[PDB]
Design an enzyme around this catalytic site. Structure first.
Site, mmCIF file in Angstrom:
data_model
loop_
_atom_site.group_PDB
_atom_site.id
_atom_site.type_symbol
_atom_site.label_atom_id
_atom_site.label_comp_id
_atom_site.label_asym_id
_atom_site.label_seq_id
_atom_site.Cartn_x
_atom_site.Cartn_y
_atom_site.Cartn_z
ATOM 1 N N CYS A 1 -39.843 5.684 23.510
ATOM 2 C CA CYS A 1 -39.989 4.258 23.257
ATOM 3 C C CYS A 1 -41.165 3.959 22.294
ATOM 4 C CB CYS A 1 -40.096 3.457 24.606
ATOM 5 S SG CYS A 1 -38.516 3.603 25.543
ATOM 6 N N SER B 1 -41.283 5.255 19.695
ATOM 7 C CA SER B 1 -40.526 5.157 18.426
ATOM 8 C C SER B 1 -39.610 3.919 18.260
ATOM 9 C CB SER B 1 -39.663 6.422 18.182
ATOM 10 O OG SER B 1 -40.526 7.478 17.747
ATOM 11 N N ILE C 1 -47.458 -2.799 19.849
ATOM 12 C CA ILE C 1 -48.628 -3.569 20.329
ATOM 13 C C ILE C 1 -49.477 -2.605 21.182
ATOM 14 C CG2 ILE C 1 -49.349 -5.370 21.903
ATOM 15 C CD1 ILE C 1 -46.507 -6.712 21.044
ATOM 16 N N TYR D 1 -39.847 -4.991 28.272
ATOM 17 C CA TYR D 1 -39.350 -3.599 28.118
ATOM 18 C C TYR D 1 -40.373 -2.629 28.735
ATOM 19 C CZ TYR D 1 -35.816 -5.743 25.172
ATOM 20 O OH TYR D 1 -34.802 -6.566 24.735
ATOM 21 N N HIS D 2 -40.922 -2.963 29.913
ATOM 22 C CA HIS D 2 -42.024 -2.134 30.499
ATOM 23 C C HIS D 2 -41.748 -1.628 31.923
ATOM 24 C CE1 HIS D 2 -44.939 -4.828 27.818
ATOM 25 N NE2 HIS D 2 -44.199 -3.994 27.089
HETATM 26 C C1 LIG Z 1 -38.046 -0.085 24.674
HETATM 27 C C2 LIG Z 1 -39.345 -0.812 24.365
HETATM 28 C C3 LIG Z 1 -40.560 -0.461 24.944
HETATM 29 C C4 LIG Z 1 -41.703 -1.180 24.575
HETATM 30 C C5 LIG Z 1 -41.603 -2.185 23.471
HETATM 31 C C6 LIG Z 1 -40.383 -2.536 22.880
HETATM 32 C C7 LIG Z 1 -39.242 -1.909 23.372
HETATM 33 C C8 LIG Z 1 -37.912 -2.284 22.797
HETATM 34 N N1 LIG Z 1 -42.768 -2.792 23.103
HETATM 35 C C9 LIG Z 1 -43.982 -2.263 23.473
HETATM 36 C C10 LIG Z 1 -45.191 -2.597 22.763
HETATM 37 O O1 LIG Z 1 -45.078 -3.288 21.705
HETATM 38 N N2 LIG Z 1 -46.351 -2.143 23.302
HETATM 39 C C11 LIG Z 1 -46.421 -1.383 24.418
HETATM 40 O O2 LIG Z 1 -47.567 -1.045 24.858
HETATM 41 N N3 LIG Z 1 -45.333 -0.917 25.067
HETATM 42 C C12 LIG Z 1 -44.138 -1.302 24.588
HETATM 43 N N4 LIG Z 1 -42.936 -0.885 25.179
HETATM 44 C C13 LIG Z 1 -43.028 0.084 26.277
HETATM 45 C C14 LIG Z 1 -43.628 1.404 25.967
HETATM 46 O O3 LIG Z 1 -43.017 1.778 24.745
HETATM 47 C C15 LIG Z 1 -42.983 2.243 27.090
HETATM 48 O O4 LIG Z 1 -43.473 1.776 28.380
HETATM 49 C C16 LIG Z 1 -43.452 3.702 26.892
HETATM 50 O O5 LIG Z 1 -43.072 4.166 25.565
HETATM 51 C C17 LIG Z 1 -42.789 4.651 27.924
HETATM 52 O O6 LIG Z 1 -43.241 5.987 27.621
HETATM 53 P P1 LIG Z 1 -42.693 7.236 28.538
HETATM 54 O O7 LIG Z 1 -43.310 8.470 27.994
HETATM 55 O O8 LIG Z 1 -42.755 6.802 29.995
HETATM 56 O O9 LIG Z 1 -41.084 7.216 28.227
HETATM 57 P P2 LIG Z 1 -40.230 7.320 26.878
HETATM 58 O O10 LIG Z 1 -41.043 6.987 25.666
HETATM 59 O O11 LIG Z 1 -38.971 6.482 27.076
HETATM 60 O O12 LIG Z 1 -39.946 8.876 26.766
HETATM 61 C C18 LIG Z 1 -38.882 9.509 27.497
HETATM 62 C C19 LIG Z 1 -38.195 10.482 26.520
HETATM 63 O O13 LIG Z 1 -37.326 11.331 27.318
HETATM 64 C C20 LIG Z 1 -36.128 11.478 26.578
HETATM 65 N N5 LIG Z 1 -35.083 11.780 27.598
HETATM 66 C C21 LIG Z 1 -34.604 10.937 28.605
HETATM 67 N N6 LIG Z 1 -33.679 11.569 29.385
HETATM 68 C C22 LIG Z 1 -33.658 12.841 28.889
HETATM 69 C C23 LIG Z 1 -32.978 14.088 29.294
HETATM 70 N N7 LIG Z 1 -32.059 14.023 30.298
HETATM 71 N N8 LIG Z 1 -33.266 15.183 28.576
HETATM 72 C C24 LIG Z 1 -34.125 15.274 27.537
HETATM 73 N N9 LIG Z 1 -34.749 14.185 27.077
HETATM 74 C C25 LIG Z 1 -34.576 13.001 27.735
HETATM 75 C C26 LIG Z 1 -35.932 10.126 25.897
HETATM 76 O O14 LIG Z 1 -34.910 10.231 24.856
HETATM 77 C C27 LIG Z 1 -37.350 9.747 25.461
HETATM 78 O O15 LIG Z 1 -37.581 10.333 24.193
#
Ligand SMILES: *Cc1cc2c(cc1C)nc1c(=O)[nH]c(=O)nc-1n2C[C@H](O)[C@H](O)[C@H](O)COP(=O)(O)OP(=O)(O)OC[C@H]1O[C@@H](n2cnc3c(N)ncnc32)[C@H](O)[C@@H]1O
EC number: 1.1.3.17
Length: 532
Positions: free
Chosen positions: A96, A98, A103, A465-466
């Site tokens: 996320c 990406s 912010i 989205y949190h």
């Molecule tokens: C979606 C979102 C989040 C968000 C935002 C706008 C949107 C549309 N705006 C934000 C902002 O401006 N400022 C901020 O501080 N936060 C903001 N958010 C939230 C923040 O991005 C999220 O809370 C944070 O990025 C979460 O990080 P975390 O490390 O917990 O999770 P992730 O980034 O989603 O990474 C998970 C990765 O795992 C991969 N994945 C998932 N399932 C699998 C399996 N089965 N196998 C292998 N890989 C997997 C995902 O593809 C992801 O890359």
């Protein structure tokens, strides 16, 4: 090296495997790999982001939602909220970090100190976090009169320049409404204050995502292997309950391949996917697993429980003059303000967007525009609590995500949100916004009573989205916390979780930079354990 075809990878054994290349997971894998005597694999279901301009260029982020880069999780029907709402989640290196709007906030010290003081998580406080936010960032405000800030870290944080005349006027309106301009990320919490944000963006417009900041520089490093396009379907354990690796599935035929870890696996798939992978792997509420035919390895009843979020409302206005045609990320200002006395953190936050935001209002007949702006109130410590559960034993099926929005028994979350819509109206009505604020398009000035505003909120709310908190850390003896304070999954060994799933309580602010700090801390915990 980067491997996007598992057929090209001969040695499938590593010291560490980090599953999920998102905010935390990229940080953990990069930091682990700084010891050249250990090998690290980072496995990510989505594609590499190098060369993908719609991911890399921050001002295009709105295009990503519901595209092929979004896992796109619908929610369960809501008792008191908006059943059409979708939890967008990025499927791409960086996770996320990406797809988001960059912010960037340090969390209030009062939030972090309570993880140890109130929720049992020994060692999790502002003392432990502050040097890690310092190490991860290169902040534009760093300098000897702000010695908390980092000036060398991989994640670049810059001030949004004050160019949007509507945003300058809105901050002038904030001041007239009793909300002064405040500097963000000084280390002192802002309870009543507003300003343009700091964003984690590079000077050329590239998002400083965890993959840009931590992974792109090290792809060719000797002891580092990046595996993209590969989806984990379960964690595997030996007869000792030691986690030995992960089963992953390729996109060609859906064949399953084993990667093996000699030291530890770190699960970083995020607050929705992590609990689902743990349950598929036999670690979760026993009766829920048994009902899907899954053999219980650990009965761990807090897995998938305690889901938290920042629920969000919107007030949309038609603009009286042409709105800006360019922007850093279209949501450049945040406003914090308390709805009651005596708080050391604000209970209410709002974002200002220089665009309309009709994703949830158009289906209910609210008028829209191509030239307007939005204020989005959100509840910063919502009291509602929800769940992430398996929809079936098939890893391909999206889980059941039920945030139970606006169900807390004191009615706090709906009360703060109704106050947030009123506060947004009062700001937009100040004389400094008089040349900008046109007609209120949603909810519309006919909606005035608490009941009219609650009905509007129930039908049209979204999320900031949190989602967090579905695999929380807590006390060693607390059975509802699946992780101990060293992020180890209780009842097995060799397995940690580091992502937004671990928070025992939501933070006040946008959580991305805190999630990267969780990855930094997990790497330090592992490197300390390796030394023994
Ligand atoms: C979606 C979102 C989040 C968000 C935002 C706008 C949107 C549309 N705006 C934000 C902002 O401006 N400022 C901020 O501080 N936060 C903001 N958010 C939230 C923040 O991005 C999220 O809370 C944070 O990025 C979460 O990080 P975390 O490390 O917990 O999770 P992730 O980034 O989603 O990474 C998970 C990765 O795992 C991969 N994945 C998932 N399932 C699998 C399996 N089965 N196998 C292998 N890989 C997997 C995902 O593809 C992801 O890359």
């Amino acid at each position: 090296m980067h491997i996007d075809n598992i057929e090209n990878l001969s040695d499938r054994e590593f010291d560490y495997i980090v599953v999920g290349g998102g905010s935390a997971g990229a940080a953990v894998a990069a930091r682990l790999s700084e010891d050249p005597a250990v090998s690290v694999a980072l496995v990510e279901a989505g594609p590499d982001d190098r060369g993908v301009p719609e991911v890399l260029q921050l001002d295009r982020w709105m295009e990503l939602l519901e595209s092929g880069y979004d896992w796109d999780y619908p929610i369960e029907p809501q008792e008191n909220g908006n059943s059409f709402m979708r939890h967008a989640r990025a499927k791409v290196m960086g996770g996320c970090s990406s797809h988001n709007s960059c912010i960037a906030f340090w969390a209030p010290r009062e939030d972090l100190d309570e993880w140890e003081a109130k929720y049992g998580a020994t060692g999790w406080n502002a003392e432990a976090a502050w040097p890690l936010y310092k190490r991860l960032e290169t902040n534009e405000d760093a300098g000897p009169d702000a010695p908390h800030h980092g000036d060398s870290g991989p994640v670049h944080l810059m001030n949004v320049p004050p160019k949007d005349p509507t945003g300058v006027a809105l901050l002038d309106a904030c001041e007239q409404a009793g909300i002064p301009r405040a500097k963000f990320n000084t280390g002192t919490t802002v309870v009543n204050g507003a300003n343009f944000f700091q964003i984690n963006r590079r000077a050329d417009g590239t998002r400083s995502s965890s993959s840009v900041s931590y992974i792109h520089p090290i792809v060719e490093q000797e002891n580092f292997t990046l595996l993209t396009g590969l989806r984990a379907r379960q964690l595997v354990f030996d007869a000792d309950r030691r986690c030995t690796g992960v089963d992953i599935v390729d996109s060609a035929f859906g064949h399953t391949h084993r990667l093996t870890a000699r030291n530890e696996v770190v699960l970083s798939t995020g607050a929705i996917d992590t609990p689902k992978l743990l349950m598929l792997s036999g670690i979760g509420p026993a009766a829920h697993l048994a009902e899907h035919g899954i053999e219980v390895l650990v009965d761990s009843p807090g897995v998938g429980e305690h889901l938290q979020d920042h629920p969000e409302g919107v007030v949309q206005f038609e603009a009286k003059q042409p709105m800006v045609a360019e922007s850093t990320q279209w949501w450049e200002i945040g406003i914090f303000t308390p709805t009651e006395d005596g708080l050391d953190r604000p209970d209410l936050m709002m974002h200002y967007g220089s665009v309309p935001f009709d994703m949830n209002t158009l289906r209910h007949g609210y008028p829209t525009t191509e030239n307007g702006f939005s204020l989005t109130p959100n509840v910063t410590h919502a009291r509602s609590r929800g769940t992430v559960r398996l929809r079936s034993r098939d890893f391909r099926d999206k889980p059941m995500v039920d945030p139970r929005y606006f169900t807390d028994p004191e009615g706090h979350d709906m009360r703060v949100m109704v106050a947030g819509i009123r506060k947004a109206r009062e700001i937009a009505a100040q004389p400094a916004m008089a040349e900008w604020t046109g007609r209120e398009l949603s909810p519309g000035v006919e909606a005035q009573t608490d009941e009219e505003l609650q009905d509007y909120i129930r039908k049209t709310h979204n999320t900031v989205y949190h989602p967090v908190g579905t695999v929380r850390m807590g006390a060693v003896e607390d059975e509802m916390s699946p992780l101990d304070p060293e992020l180890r999954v209780k009842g097995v060994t060799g397995l940690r979780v580091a992502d937004a799933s671990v928070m025992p309580e939501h933070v006040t602010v946008n959580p991305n930079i805190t999630v990267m700090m969780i990855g930094e801390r997990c790497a330090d915990l592992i490197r300390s354990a390796r030394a023994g």
